[PDB]
Design an enzyme around this catalytic site. Sequence first.
Site, mmCIF file in Angstrom:
data_model
loop_
_atom_site.group_PDB
_atom_site.id
_atom_site.type_symbol
_atom_site.label_atom_id
_atom_site.label_comp_id
_atom_site.label_asym_id
_atom_site.label_seq_id
_atom_site.Cartn_x
_atom_site.Cartn_y
_atom_site.Cartn_z
ATOM 1 N N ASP A 116 0.807 -1.199 0.000
ATOM 2 C CA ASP A 116 0.000 0.000 0.000
ATOM 3 C C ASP A 116 0.859 1.277 0.000
ATOM 4 O O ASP A 116 2.067 1.244 0.297
ATOM 5 C CB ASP A 116 -0.955 -0.065 1.174
ATOM 6 N N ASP A 146 -9.156 3.199 -3.482
ATOM 7 C CA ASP A 146 -10.324 3.472 -2.622
ATOM 8 C C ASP A 146 -11.510 4.095 -3.413
ATOM 9 O O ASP A 146 -11.379 5.169 -4.028
ATOM 10 C CB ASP A 146 -9.892 4.439 -1.476
ATOM 11 N N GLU A 177 3.067 6.800 -2.847
ATOM 12 C CA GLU A 177 2.874 7.909 -3.781
ATOM 13 C C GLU A 177 3.479 9.257 -3.318
ATOM 14 O O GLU A 177 4.127 9.964 -4.121
ATOM 15 C CB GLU A 177 1.366 8.128 -4.063
HETATM 16 O O1 LIG Z 1 -13.057 4.901 6.432
HETATM 17 N N1 LIG Z 1 -12.231 5.542 7.378
HETATM 18 O O2 LIG Z 1 -12.463 5.326 8.800
HETATM 19 C C1 LIG Z 1 -11.249 6.335 6.882
HETATM 20 C C2 LIG Z 1 -10.456 7.122 7.716
HETATM 21 C C3 LIG Z 1 -9.467 7.933 7.178
HETATM 22 C C4 LIG Z 1 -9.248 7.981 5.810
HETATM 23 O O3 LIG Z 1 -8.232 8.773 5.366
HETATM 24 C C5 LIG Z 1 -7.548 8.382 4.116
HETATM 25 O O4 LIG Z 1 -7.230 6.990 3.954
HETATM 26 C C6 LIG Z 1 -6.935 6.884 2.587
HETATM 27 C C7 LIG Z 1 -6.990 5.574 1.875
HETATM 28 S S1 LIG Z 1 -7.176 4.135 2.957
HETATM 29 C C8 LIG Z 1 -5.876 2.812 2.703
HETATM 30 O O5 LIG Z 1 -5.415 2.245 3.935
HETATM 31 C C9 LIG Z 1 -6.393 1.381 4.588
HETATM 32 C C10 LIG Z 1 -6.964 0.233 3.729
HETATM 33 O O6 LIG Z 1 -8.116 -0.305 4.437
HETATM 34 C C11 LIG Z 1 -7.368 0.755 2.326
HETATM 35 O O7 LIG Z 1 -7.812 -0.352 1.484
HETATM 36 C C12 LIG Z 1 -6.203 1.627 1.758
HETATM 37 O O8 LIG Z 1 -6.349 2.195 0.437
HETATM 38 C C13 LIG Z 1 -5.522 7.382 2.454
HETATM 39 O O9 LIG Z 1 -5.072 7.004 1.188
HETATM 40 C C14 LIG Z 1 -5.608 8.870 2.594
HETATM 41 O O10 LIG Z 1 -4.376 9.493 2.449
HETATM 42 C C15 LIG Z 1 -6.215 9.141 3.961
HETATM 43 O O11 LIG Z 1 -6.470 10.509 4.112
HETATM 44 C C16 LIG Z 1 -10.044 7.210 4.971
HETATM 45 C C17 LIG Z 1 -11.034 6.405 5.504
#
Ligand SMILES: O=[N+]([O-])c1ccc(O[C@@H]2O[C@H](CS[C@H]3OC[C@@H](O)[C@H](O)[C@H]3O)[C@@H](O)[C@H](O)[C@H]2O)cc1
Lengths: 258, 773, 773
Positions: free
Chosen positions: B416, B482, B419
């Site tokens: 993961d 996402d 970037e």
């Molecule tokens: O659903 N939430 O509780 C949530 C919290 C913060 C979040 O912030 C964002 O997560 C984003 C994607 S989440 C990433 O890590 C956890 C895995 O479960 C995902 O599949 C993966 O893409 C990051 O890329 C961003 O930079 C960040 O700001 C997103 C979701």
Amino acid sequence: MKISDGNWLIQPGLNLIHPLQVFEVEQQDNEMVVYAAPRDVRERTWQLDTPLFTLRFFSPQEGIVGVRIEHFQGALNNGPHYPLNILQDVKVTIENTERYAEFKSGNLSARVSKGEFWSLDFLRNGERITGSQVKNNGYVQDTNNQRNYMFERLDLGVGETVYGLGERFTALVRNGQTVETWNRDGGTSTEQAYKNIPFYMTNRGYGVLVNHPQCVSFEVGSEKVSKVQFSVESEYLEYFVIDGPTPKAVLDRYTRFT
Amino acid sequence: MKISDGNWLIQPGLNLIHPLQVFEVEQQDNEMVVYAAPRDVRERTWQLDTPLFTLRFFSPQEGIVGVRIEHFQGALNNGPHYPLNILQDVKVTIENTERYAEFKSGNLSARVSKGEFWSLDFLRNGERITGSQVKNNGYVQDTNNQRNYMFERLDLGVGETVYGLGERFTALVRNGQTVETWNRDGGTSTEQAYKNIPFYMTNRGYGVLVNHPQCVSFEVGSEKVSKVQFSVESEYLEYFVIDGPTPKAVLDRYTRFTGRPALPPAWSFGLWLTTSFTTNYDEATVNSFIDGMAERNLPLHVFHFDCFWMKAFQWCDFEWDPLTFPDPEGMIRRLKAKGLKICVWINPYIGQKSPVFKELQEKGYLLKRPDGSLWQWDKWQPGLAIYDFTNPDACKWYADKLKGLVAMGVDCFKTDFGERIPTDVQWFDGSDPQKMHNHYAYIYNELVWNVLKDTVGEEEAVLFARSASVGAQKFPVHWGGDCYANYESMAESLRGGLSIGLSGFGFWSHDIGGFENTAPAHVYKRWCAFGLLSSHSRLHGSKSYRVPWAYDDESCDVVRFFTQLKCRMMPYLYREAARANARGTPMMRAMMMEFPDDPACDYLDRQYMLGDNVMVAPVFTEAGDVQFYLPEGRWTHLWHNDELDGSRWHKQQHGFLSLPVYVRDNTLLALGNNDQRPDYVWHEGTAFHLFNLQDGHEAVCEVPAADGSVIFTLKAARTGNTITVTGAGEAKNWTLCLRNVVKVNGLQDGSQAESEQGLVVKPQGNALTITLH
Amino acid sequence: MKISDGNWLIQPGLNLIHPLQVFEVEQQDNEMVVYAAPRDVRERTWQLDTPLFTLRFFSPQEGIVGVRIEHFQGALNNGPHYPLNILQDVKVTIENTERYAEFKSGNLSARVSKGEFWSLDFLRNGERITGSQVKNNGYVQDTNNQRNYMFERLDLGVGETVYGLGERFTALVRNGQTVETWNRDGGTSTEQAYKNIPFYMTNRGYGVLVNHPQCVSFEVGSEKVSKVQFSVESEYLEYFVIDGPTPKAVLDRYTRFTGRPALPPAWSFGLWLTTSFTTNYDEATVNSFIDGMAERNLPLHVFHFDCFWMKAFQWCDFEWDPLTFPDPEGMIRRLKAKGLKICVWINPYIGQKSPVFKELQEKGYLLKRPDGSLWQWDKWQPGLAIYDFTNPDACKWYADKLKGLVAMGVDCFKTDFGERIPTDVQWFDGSDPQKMHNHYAYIYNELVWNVLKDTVGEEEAVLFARSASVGAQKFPVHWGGDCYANYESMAESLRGGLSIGLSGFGFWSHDIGGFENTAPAHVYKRWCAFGLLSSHSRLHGSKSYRVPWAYDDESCDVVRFFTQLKCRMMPYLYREAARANARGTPMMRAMMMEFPDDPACDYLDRQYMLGDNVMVAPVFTEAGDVQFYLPEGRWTHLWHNDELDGSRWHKQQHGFLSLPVYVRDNTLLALGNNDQRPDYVWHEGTAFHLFNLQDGHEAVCEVPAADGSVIFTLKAARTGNTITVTGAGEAKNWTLCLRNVVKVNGLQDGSQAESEQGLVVKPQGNALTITLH
Ligand SMILES: O=[N+]([O-])c1ccc(O[C@@H]2O[C@H](CS[C@H]3OC[C@@H](O)[C@H](O)[C@H]3O)[C@@H](O)[C@H](O)[C@H]2O)cc1
Ligand SMILES: O=[N+]([O-])c1ccc(O[C@@H]2O[C@H](CS[C@H]3OC[C@@H](O)[C@H](O)[C@H]3O)[C@@H](O)[C@H](O)[C@H]2O)cc1
């Protein structure tokens, strides 16, 4: 250094963040570490994209409690450092409960409140001699000049007066004064001093050494009128609360220490 | 980057010089050097007090012509550089005549016109496929910011359309777009991309790689409407024109040049499930969901532990949370004993709260600012620092942690992030931070791939990777990122999917229902069918498990139905996956890639080909309305068996157990006899299916082994009303279904029996010849 | 303008606030006001120290909902404003409930959700067609440059495509593009446009006008890939959602709202020829070229005098060059005697060399800088100044100069230029310079139009206009600009022409072969067919004479053929011209406009419909290869008579006398009996052609009078094998051809005769009936 703009506002271009909630406490031999978030992180969804403060409590000498509050540890932090006498074997108590995290050396403790209502309190045999109210410490990001600071504001009680901060020629009692701890050749008739010391004591029988040899900026009841504010250009702030309970006793511990 | 200000003017503050006239041509072994002046220098009096461009033409591989256009050679030019495979001995032709200088590799030449009328033309057997017209390349001095750039504009013909440039979520056809090849974490809903690639291809059957790891600014019909403009801050510009003449031919050349997609293990083609993100994980919870799947006869093959396998604010330090996971190795063994494969979440950053952070800081393993302080911010994790993968000892530390996980029975990793790589830093190896921004994703993912390759073995290696750069397609599988739980978002995800295969990546995963914790059940159902008709398929939510019984019984029937289908499709699917490895042909193919001569296919982005022979059109409505296009031929529904004629659009209504999945005519297709797992012996029990074999045609089916080699081949050839069947290699107990044929006149060397889908023939002897009515 | 930085972040230095919660709703007569806080304000402790948005909903016309969103009302907000037709008594419905506030006009409504989940939805008969999701509108405080903006983002659905935004030359479907609505002189090959309009429409049957004459910055799926984002530097944002449900219906409401195309005179549909740009004109020279046309039997209807009727460096001062033009009126009247209408070049600038320059400076009739000095530069003309058309005496001076030319025999004008209007100026009337930049195009053309209305009469008024802004479609015809002579340029031009039609403009002219002096003959010939199968049609060169005999004899044949054809087509064409005037349906239609429910037509841009019933596909190759799509039906070539089945692509090869020009089934088409001029009595001698009338259909043909009204209607209805023909109105000596019908069973009330295209039937009595075999 001006941080607030009166009660309701902040100086333009300063972004502030404060320790406002205990996330975790950890005891590491004779030291206590409190990780504190700048927002509510009870829920895992919010346990990311947030700064986090690391507060460490420790005792260099009996009746002295050291407090290091840190944002980033990645900074260079070169010396010199002050010639402090620091023991590794001071007898202390660390009590981590549902309500509080408490670190005690001699009769002096530092206590942090867990849960919704953050507080940092300094107690002498369980009575509060000073402390830091929520949002009165933290990190200052000055977007005007690209510098960052750490600050604290320690409470003053009714009739509590401040003294010291070196050989100064202003009014003896420091309440109402800003003081910059920076050696200058300015004579004996100005706010300037040849002999600067970031140490103050009060008529409540404690003192405090701000442990930074660089310029330390004190607003001694001059920004928040019932607190001693201090700030430094640093990623961490470190200060020592020194018990008395008399002025002479503070001075005894201070001079043993330094 | 804007250079012109309309046709007539130039952007304020920019000074341009162009190669306008050939001064001299030199042959230097198998390379052609052209010296080009910015003005008429035919007279000696003008042969001074002027710039001169040096153009070098070379061929690193057959049918690839490299073009390097340089101003000043005294510039520093540090790496990293892309992991290109460059041959020194490619057979080329160089002809330097009075009218032209021409460099030829295979059928592709670059021709420069001498004399007064400068021209740079790219030709295929002497027919121009694109080029650069005078004043459309050269050097830009930006007197506003004191930066200097090189640029080119390659022509587009009438109706010529552009594709690729990485996994991107904009409109599929790139004309009208500006694109900046710069990795970002921007979701799946913007012009940003996690996986940028400075490669495009067109519907004229060629591609171009702009050979710069730094940001390349493309104006794709967005400045000059009939050209692809690209520019880079550099004293030289180097690009490669890559011949086809078909899209698959371009990608074969592009992937031989930059890296072939690895062939992932068959188990990886099953259903993945995760813990979800901000839910709570522990062994009991994990097992309730795993048992829940099994109770409902929902096959499950890979299970993934997400971020919270580690302590909050300490990610990624590789330490299992001891409250939640008191016996990590025992828990994973107990899952493995069920037949599951295990994935865990990783990334290449580390939070300051971790006890290991201090160790890394002291050892110098974290990325530094020029003053030697650590680079840190508070996005993702507090006091976050980046692992310095240019520091060999840091690579080793990181690899050793991954090895400790594998040693505990972890089978693969989600690579993961990667970037948001800063430039105001000094890398251990002193490389150019502008180039390291994108290439970091390659080095990170290579490191992780190699751990697997050195432990479980290369045949068993697989990732779910969020970020990429040129060459990273060698380390599959790439994961779409996402998404919100809605039909618009499902559509933009499929654009990203098609795009990444148009940029050299053979395999693409995504998450069914997206990530947003509450999907409507209808969206989740539609998205399940798409997800399981993709190379790689995962269920992963945000604040709750993405298990179908969160919705309704029907969602469970949907998950079961399509999981079973994919498992049965594996003898076909795995052969098509070996094509991605051999020729870089992605599993999910844009309609334009499979049918490059059909003008109805240029903009089709809501359907795709899954391998050579099956068209899939996901359903983007609750009601089940779907419109799709079929190319020429009589197509047959994979399990409904209804037929449709092509060379036109179709409109249907499908329930949640259905969608358009149409098999081409003249096709022989292998389905297997296991609907419970993807990894099984495909060449035993094989059910072959012959669809619309026309007179004069032959259909070939290649059944692969576990390693993707062809273990058995069956061929059905029709002449008149006789179809002759011949098999070569190893297979047992197979059968041949004559789809939609209810009756046969006769059969030599086999038995027969009725089925709902048509006559099922069983062989004995091999004529296996069958006689139609 | 970029506002977000991917999904997760905001651009550095921007502070955003959004309407997030309804605080109060108020009905004010026929208008709904919503007060919307940017935070939770349910408790009184939060009902202070907060911004508040003010949203006003209102209806200027049935089926259009206006949405005004405001931050501060204390801003100056000077004009100009767009020339919108605003009614005050449109029947509306306002509903204010616990759950929603909803404003409805016709079938279209805006509904705002109360409580925790803000939403703004546009519904057609209760079904959502677009909307704004929470945080996708609001106020942008740009802290880097101290500018403030308002923005909105309106959702796009799965496969929803965007069109219009003026005459633009990028890809036709706007998804993926940034567009700035700011008139520029950038040629016809870039992202810049002379004719900008902040209105778009989609393949979902609605449209939106952003009601700001300043620059509006559109990110059309280019920031959020499934939204149309627009911003403007303003304390408020106002836009109008315009219902269809069909593209034609949207343009109907749009052109009622902002202005209907005028009906140009029938002569204007003839062949225009110009002096060319830098030819040395003089009476003899001009007549020799006009005589050359007549000598080769090349019909010619309008002659245009370009820039050099005036003296070099004194453009536009209205003084005939006395050395070249000793007797201007004598000359022009001699030219008119030959059966020509006369156009002259004009523009809204003037060179310092002109004697008249000092007159105007002293009268104050020229645009000034804020210090009172004249605004000047040396682009186009040395020390060029601009006529300040906000000065009523300056407008009178200019109109009087135009009246002088009309008094001399000038019929019409080419209103050239109007784009490069500076903003560092003080207008006579004190208007906002930022709004005057675009709106100048309108005032300029409006003034010229009214000179024509006031002299030659409204019915005789026509222009060739190079720039435009909203409203200016009232002042046809709009001319597509300076083009290079190649096939790519030709295709770019067609996208621009199709685009203007999709922006409210009913007529579009362009130059055959472009402007550049040496096009190959093959290009000129291809472009000739395209030009004459457009509403308006001209021959104009740069250095070169644009007479076909320059090239070859065949160029003369091509010109002749297509000019004869267009003239014969006028009975059809002028009826379609009246549709543009009555409903804003352009003559040249994008395929998606005519066939909105056919998904094959979404991206089609190399072909078009020319009125209701004929598809033209220009040929963009020398060899004559062309691929085109035909909608459902059996289509017939208009003169080759070959038939093709639709719902599919076709590939053909055409010589220079041909291209795909296909007539739709169930069509009755009127051809006229004059192949020499467009303006004649179309209803005498008419040749009706009936194309593939199916059992149970009817074909209607309306023949117009010179004022565009219907003078005669012919209907053919088939039931079984009987076709019943019914005429109403005034026609004489007409005939009916049964295309591809050689033999019929019988005829009541008519006589028949063979013809190569099919049976020609002459009526008597009009109980006319044909019975098929
Ligand atoms: O659903 N939430 O509780 C949530 C919290 C913060 C979040 O912030 C964002 O997560 C984003 C994607 S989440 C990433 O890590 C956890 C895995 O479960 C995902 O599949 C993966 O893409 C990051 O890329 C961003 O930079 C960040 O700001 C997103 C979701
Ligand atoms: O406890 N509250 O509900 C509360 C909320 C907002 C508040 O905002 C501040 O109110 C301040 C004081 S309130 C003022 O108006 C209301 C009266 O009841 C008070 O006595 C008067 O001082 C203002 O001066 C500041 O500018 C403003 O930021 C104050 C209190």
